[PDB]
RNA sequence: GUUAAUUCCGAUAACGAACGAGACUCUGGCAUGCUAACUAGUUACGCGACCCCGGUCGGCGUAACUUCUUAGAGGGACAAGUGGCGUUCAGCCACCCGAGAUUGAGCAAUAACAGGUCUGUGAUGCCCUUAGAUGUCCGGGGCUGCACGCGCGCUACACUGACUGGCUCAGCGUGUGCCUACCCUACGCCGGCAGGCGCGGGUAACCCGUUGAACCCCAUUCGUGAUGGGGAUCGGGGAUUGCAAUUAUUCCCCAUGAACGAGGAAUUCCCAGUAAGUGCGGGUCAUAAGCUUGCGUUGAUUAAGUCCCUGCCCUUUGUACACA
């Protein structure tokens, strides 16, 4: 009955857009439903060379993707989460439920 | 009857220390052991300095426990140092007179801006092509 | 001490400056002096905010040079500490008195530039810098490759400067400097 | 008690080379070849000696058991890894060697070296680096 | 045999087992994060990837 | 080094001339009304335009503006 | 150019004058009693210990790097 | 009373080990007197009982904070690898000499085996170090 | 005239404009206000342990909360206010209030370089080889070679230091792979050590990890000696990774113990959490950082100017240059 909702993604506005909508859908149907947590953020750094070859003033590239994780606790049985989570689904947000 | 806890944070540039004041006897504590053993002990005056500032008599029904996470020995000694101080005006602010508060922040401000305000400097990052945050590596002519 | 501020055990207060163009340049009289000259920053922001930084923090920030030493304000707060001891042991005086009047019979008045060259006389906290450089430069030559401690060495620098014996380093350098400007106007 | 004594020793006979009394003993032994500040602390601790004092206050059949001890590293309680002959070639014996036949098993194994004309004999015969160094940039103030 | 000998090598370490997965070449390798890709076409694929240059 | 470009000043003179009723002498005042009566996308250049505003109101104040 | 000739122990004739001059310095310190007397650093330190245990020079601040030492007090 | 935490440490340790050399039951090994305690170190130490203070100094980081098993031990006495030549590093603690320390203090007791791992301090070990901060407040007083 | 700026004020054969700069995005402190938290803590308790009612416990669990932790909407600073200088316009300096009254990075205009890359491409044109191959594979060597010089770095020349114990503080980060055969490690034993053996945890705020990192703090040993600075060279031995270490892959133990006493002409980088000291992460990685890129601790001297040297940008002048 404790289902967990993991929500990762790369977007930052879609992703508040997403986890806005859980929020109003699991209060439109009446659930106790926890707090959306923020998991701390994540910044893939590459350094490389601009240059192709290695001759000419010595450059780097900070190459950066940030990934962001949130996640939702429900007290609900599984057909309510399945109906949430099967509608208004987006790609830049890549939903996990966890059962147990 | 009613808690008077009193949560007070003070920033250095990654130490960050949490002052908590409550209603007691005359004792101060950081991290479980009072001001007399924190290892740099050449900055015991400069832990001290409000306590002689401000008399005994302002500490003695304030007790002060630190918890205490971040930076280094100078950075966390400050840290401390203007946690407890920022605390002390907070709990004047909320639990007696404002004038007796107006007045400590006046001689506080007279005495130094670091017991109240915090510094905004950080640590300016390291560029490509240089051993550090200004300094380049050395150039070759011919 | 709520009135009185206690540098260590040496008090605010005695503090003679004689000569009258360095009293608003040499911040140690009623509103900079502290407990230890050990402090956070931002003096160095402003152009005359320097002016502002009490000497015995400056002469603490001067003091570590050369590379291995730079960063070390802990301890060259613990080598002025026992310097001022020494100080106090030899002469019986106060230190910081004994400092002011090394400053004030060390510092230059005069010296040479470039516009072949040409005398002028310095700026009074120019005078306090050439002052404070000096004496820390005499006190580490002294004390590099010799039994003779740092404190032991930046103590007799600051009393051979007090006293104007010609003994000091920087009363020498002084002397030479005096004797350069006036032998190029 | 810190004052001169009598029978004051300024230079020591210990393995045909001279010992400066003036030094700690701990560290006037390690002017012999052979042994060193490591191994020296080691037969100081395992012989019941205070090395706080001088190396001239210490007196002489103190110092034929000091000898004895360092000539016998097996019999007097010291382990096999303070020895710089671990598993020798000629006789195989765990032992330390002491300022003369260091020198001599040295020659030696240069001269086995030699005798075989192995690379590592022929760098040493040519007066080259042996360990995999690099003679393009370093190595200039041997060769004129 | 020439089976048994074309085969020969071990090819479970080196920079050499190891390739870019689009040149197939065994220089400038970026084996982080499972990329296995050269540093020029990762220049010229960042876009496509994700990665973009905020700082 | 703060001087203003064409892009605040031609802006902030279109936005006097047009609202000359609605705006006043408080910074946060017309601040906020320039950000309700002008589409500007950025805090820092409304920033920029609410102080172009405000001093041009002191110029009023003080005199005729060409 | 030139070797420093410090003394290791006491000589008598030293040792009667570090008893005699020595409480009558103002700085009693290991350096300059090592400048003063031709003798190590180490064996001043030991005879400022031997002299503390003797009970006729006074402590003024310890460290671990230089030790201060002054006379008697005059009263 | 009063804890170990308004007891100076510098001498705590010191007055834990005249109490170690006071008791003398410890089961010291036989290597104690020749070891070299890291891989980073360079001399033998100069005090002969070194191994009574290092199990002060075990007694009371584990009256501070427990869980400390080998590699914590390896980690609170690492220091400076000096390489020589190359730039000088960190590098943990000899595993062998923390491992002997902790079965001696389980050889007497004075700490405990805890589940998930690590090393507890038992009762009577915070008996021992509070009545021995008592004497060193009493000392000091 | 002014500005970091062709940035604006204002005259004006100009007017309307466009790129760049500015503007923009991200990073950093200001929020005791909002949203949230059992993958983070705080305060009160129920206990348990110890010392003489009180103190501590990262030892356990819970009634609220986000102050410490994290990330979203935001807000906050704009020359806003005062006093001077200035056509009273564009602007400049100081100051009260205030966390900032000039943080840094990315992008960065027209046009050109006979700059580098065919050794990044199954991006490619021309020429050459194409079976005794310049295709490809296997075995070994070499890319490390050494009378010499140059460039970037590391270690020191010491007592402001070396060694030995005690104490005490981080964040960027990374972590089990299509092929891929190779992850980070808690804890207990064997050993001084590198390491070995067993069960665990972790696809990552769960486990390493409260990331117990160095300089620094305290207490002995040293005594101006190329000495307990320095660790070059070299011998003997023990393990790890790999099919294979010999030209010592790397790590550890003992021993041998060179130059170097602050470095000439000349030259590099920099002015605020900056230089510099110091250590920790990623890439190269099976074994590996004397490199590079990020991050943390300590943390200054001196300057708020100039064309003197080296160059750049507008105006005028001269040219017999225009591969200038």
Redesign the pocket.
């Given at each position: 009955h404790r289902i967990?909702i993991?929500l990762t993604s790369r977007n930052?506005?879609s992703?508040?857009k997403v986890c806005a909508d859980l929020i109003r859908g699991a209060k439109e149907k009446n659930l106790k439903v926890?707090?959306?947590?923020?998991?701390?953020?994540?910044?893939?750094?590459i350094?490389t060379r601009?240059?192709?070859?290695?001759?000419?003033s010595?450059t780097?590239d900070?190459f950066?993707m940030r990934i962001?994780?949130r996640?939702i606790?429900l007290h609900s049985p599984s057909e309510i989460v399945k109906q949430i989570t099967s509608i208004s689904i987006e790609p830049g947000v890549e939903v996990e439920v966890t059962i147990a | 009857g009613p808690?008077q806890?009193v949560?007070?944070?003070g920033?250095?540039?990654?130490?960050?220390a949490?002052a908590?004041c409550?209603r007691?006897?005359g004792?101060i504590?950081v991290?479980?052991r009072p001001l007399e053993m924190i290892?740099?002990?050449?900055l015991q005056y400069k832990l001290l300095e409000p306590v002689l500032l401000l008399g005994k008599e302002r500490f003695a029904g304030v007790?002060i426990?630190v918890?205490?996470?971040?930076?280094?020995?100078?950075?966390?000694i400050?840290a401390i140092r203007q946690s407890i101080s920022?605390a002390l005006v907070?709990y004047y602010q909320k639990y007696v007179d404002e004038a007796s508060k107006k007045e400590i922040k006046d001689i506080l401000?007279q005495y130094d801006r670091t017991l109240l305000?915090?510094?905004?400097?950080?640590?300016?990052?390291?560029?490509?092509?240089?051993?550090?945050?200004?300094?380049?590596?050395?150039?070759?002519?011919? | 001490t709520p009135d009185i501020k206690l540098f260590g055990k040496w008090s605010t207060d005695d503090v003679q400056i004689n000569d009258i163009s360095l009293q608003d340049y040499i911040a140690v009289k009623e509103k900079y002096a502290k407990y230890l000259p050990?402090?956070?920053?931002?003096?160095?922001?402003?152009?005359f905010?320097?002016a502002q930084?009490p000497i015995v923090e400056?002469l603490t920030?001067?003091?570590?040079?050369?590379?291995?030493?730079?960063?070390?304000?802990?301890?060259?707060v613990?080598?002025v500490k026992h310097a001022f001891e020494i100080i106090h042991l030899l002469t019986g005086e106060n230190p910081l008195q004994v400092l002011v009047n090394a400053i004030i019979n060390s510092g230059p008045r005069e010296d040479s530039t470039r516009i072949r060259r040409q005398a002028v006389d310095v700026?009074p906290?120019?005078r306090?810098?050439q002052a404070?450089?000096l004496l820390?430069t005499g006190?580490?030559e002294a004390?590099?490759?010799?039994?003779?401690?740092?404190?032991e060495?930046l103590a007799d620098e600051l009393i051979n400067a007090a006293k104007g014996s010609s003994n000091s380093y920087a009363i020498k350098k002084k002397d030479e400097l005096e004797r350069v400007a006036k032998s190029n106007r | 008690s810190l004052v001169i004594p009598e029978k004051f020793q300024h230079i020591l006979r210990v393995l045909n080379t001279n010992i400066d009394g003036?030094?700690?003993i701990?560290?006037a032994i390690?002017a012999?070849?052979?042994?060193?500040?490591?191994?020296?602390h080691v037969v100081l601790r395992k012989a019941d000696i205070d090395l706080?004092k001088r190396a001239g206050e210490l007196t002489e059949d103190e110092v034929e058991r000091v000898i004895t001890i360092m000539q016998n590293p097996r019999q007097y309680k010291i382990?096999?890894?303070?020895?710089?002959?671990?598993?020798?070639?000629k006789d195989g014996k765990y032992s330390?060697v002491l300022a003369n036949g260091?020198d001599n098993?040295?020659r030696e194994?240069?001269e086995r070296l030699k005798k075989i004309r192995?690379?590592?004999g022929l760098?040493?015969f040519?007066?080259?680096?042996?360990?995999?160094?690099?003679?393009?940039?370093?190595?200039?103030?041997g060769?004129? | 045999g020439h089976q048994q000998?074309?085969?020969?090598?071990?090819?479970?370490?080196?920079?050499g087992?190891?390739?870019?997965?689009?040149?197939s070449?065994r220089?400038?390798?970026?084996?982080?994060?499972?990329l296995?890709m050269?540093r020029?076409?990762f220049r010229?694929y960042a876009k496509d990837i994700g990665f973009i240059?905020?700082? | 080094?703060?001087?203003?470009?064409?892009?605040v000043?031609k802006a902030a003179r279109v936005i006097i001339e047009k609202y000359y009723t609605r705006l006043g002498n408080d910074?946060?005042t017309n601040?906020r009304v320039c950000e309700e009566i002008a589409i500007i996308?950025?805090?820092?250049?409304r920033?920029?335009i609410?102080?172009?505003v405000?001093?041009?109101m002191?110029?009023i104040q003080?005199?005729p503006?060409? | 150019r030139?070797?420093?000739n410090?003394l290791?122990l006491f000589d008598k004739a030293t040792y009667d004058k570090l008893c005699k001059e020595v409480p009558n310095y103002k700085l009693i310190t290991?350096?300059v009693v090592?400048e003063r007397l031709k003798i190590?650093?180490?064996?001043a330190?030991?005879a400022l210990?031997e002299l503390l245990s003797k009970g006729l020079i006074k402590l003024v601040s310890?460290?671990?790097?230089?030790?201060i030492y002054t006379r008697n007090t005059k009263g | 009373?009063?804890?170990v935490?308004?007891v100076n440490?510098?001498e705590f340790?010191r007055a834990l080990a005249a109490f170690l050399k006071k008791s003398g039951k410890l089961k010291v090994?036989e290597?104690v007197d020749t070891?070299?305690?890291?891989?980073?170190?360079?001399?033998?130490?100069?005090?002969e009982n070194?191994f009574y203070?290092?199990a002060?100094?075990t007694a009371?980081?584990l009256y501070?904070?427990?869980?400390?098993?080998?590699?914590?031990?390896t980690?609170?006495?690492?220091?400076?690898?000096?390489?020589?030549?190359?730039?000088?590093?960190?590098?943990?603690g000899?595993?062998?000499?923390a491992?002997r320390v902790?079965?001696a203090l389980?050889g007497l007791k004075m700490v405990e085996?805890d589940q998930?791992?690590?090393?507890?301090l038992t009762?009577?070990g915070?008996?021992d170090?509070?009545?021995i901060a008592?004497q060193v407040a009493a000392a000091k007083k």
């Open positions: 967990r993991t930052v506005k992703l508040e926890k707090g959306p947590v923020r998991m701390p953020t994540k910044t893939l750094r350094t601009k240059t192709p070859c290695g001759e000419g010595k780097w900070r950066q962001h994780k996640l606790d | 808690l806890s949560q007070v944070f920033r250095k540039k990654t130490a960050t949490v908590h409550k007691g006897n004792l504590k991290n479980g290892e740099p002990r050449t007790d426990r918890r205490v996470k971040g930076g280094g020995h100078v950075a966390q400050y920022k907070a401000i305000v915090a510094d905004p400097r950080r640590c300016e990052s390291k560029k490509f092509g240089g051993p550090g945050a200004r300094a380049r590596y050395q150039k070759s002519y011919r | 050990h402090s956070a920053g931002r003096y160095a922001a402003k152009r905010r320097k930084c400056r920030n001067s003091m570590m040079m050369h590379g291995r030493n730079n960063g070390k304000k802990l301890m060259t613990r080598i700026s906290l120019r306090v810098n404070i450089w820390c006190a580490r004390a590099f490759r010799n039994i003779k401690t740092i404190a060495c | 003036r030094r700690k701990a560290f390690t012999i070849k052979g042994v060193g500040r490591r191994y020296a706080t382990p096999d890894w303070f020895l710089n002959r671990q598993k020798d070639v330390q260091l098993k040295l194994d240069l192995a690379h590592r760098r040493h040519w007066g080259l680096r042996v360990r995999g160094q690099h003679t393009k940039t370093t190595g200039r103030r060769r004129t | 000998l074309y085969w020969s090598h071990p090819r479970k370490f080196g920079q087992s190891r390739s870019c997965r689009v040149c070449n220089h400038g390798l970026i084996r982080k994060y499972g296995n050269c020029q076409c010229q240059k905020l700082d | 080094g703060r001087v203003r470009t064409k892009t000043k910074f946060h601040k996308p950025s805090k820092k250049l920033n920029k609410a102080g172009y405000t001093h041009l002191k110029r003080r005199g503006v060409r | 030139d070797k420093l410090n290791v290991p350096a090592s190590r650093g180490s064996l330190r030991a210990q310890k460290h671990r790097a230089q030790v | 009373g009063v804890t935490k308004d440490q510098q340790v090994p290597w070891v070299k305690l890291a891989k980073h170190k360079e001399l033998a130490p100069y005090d070194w203070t290092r002060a100094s009371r980081h501070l904070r427990g869980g400390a098993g080998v590699g914590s031990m980690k609170i006495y690492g220091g400076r690898q000096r390489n020589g030549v190359m730039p000088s590093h960190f590098s943990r000899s595993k062998s000499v491992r902790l079965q389980e085996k998930d791992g690590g090393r507890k009762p009577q915070q008996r170090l509070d009545r008592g």
